């Protein structure tokens, strides 16, 4: 039951990079994603949400293999946003391309790169405005997160986003 880590990221700017140290106490499969945070819906109409759910997208997509696990069409995009949105519009959502680099800290201190990965993150993901990016199988052990937002992104001005890492319980 190890407590998630969460990396705040800045996606209104091109080449933003945040690198954090990451300690993983269990060796199993996590789960990589963003959180998007959003006004309650309380404080305005729930219309924040909407721009949230549309920048989101509608589709959903497993992390684990990438397989299509939701599908939604226009229709009921539109039924779901009105006005905010056009026929042109994309149910898998705004793509944001995503680099994520993973170092881990050897015995001796040394680094050793063990992955690299630009994600052409899209979709819905499984919590609350989230994204899914990825799921990842980490040994117990010490390492560092490089974590780069390709595209500016000017609907983000402003907006908390978390890059977050949690175990995945199944």
Known sequence: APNPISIPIDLSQAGSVVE?????????????????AVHDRKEDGGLDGKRVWKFLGFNSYDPRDGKQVGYVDYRL????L????????????TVVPIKITIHQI???????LIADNLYMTKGNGS??????????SLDKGKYIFRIENI??????????????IYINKR
């Open 20 to 36: 954090k140290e990451v300690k993983i106490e269990e060796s199993w499969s996590y789960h990589l994603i963003l959180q998007f």
């Open 106 to 112: 050897n015995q001796d201190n040394t680094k050793k």
């Open 151 to 164: 595209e500016a992104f000017s609907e983000m001005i402003g907006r908390k986003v978390d890059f977050t």
């Open 127 to 136: 919590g609350a405005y989230t994204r899914d990016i990825t799921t990842i």
């Open 77 to 80: 995009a539109k039924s779901e």
């Open 82 to 93: 009105g006005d905010l949105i056009d026929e042109t519009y994309d149910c898998d959502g």
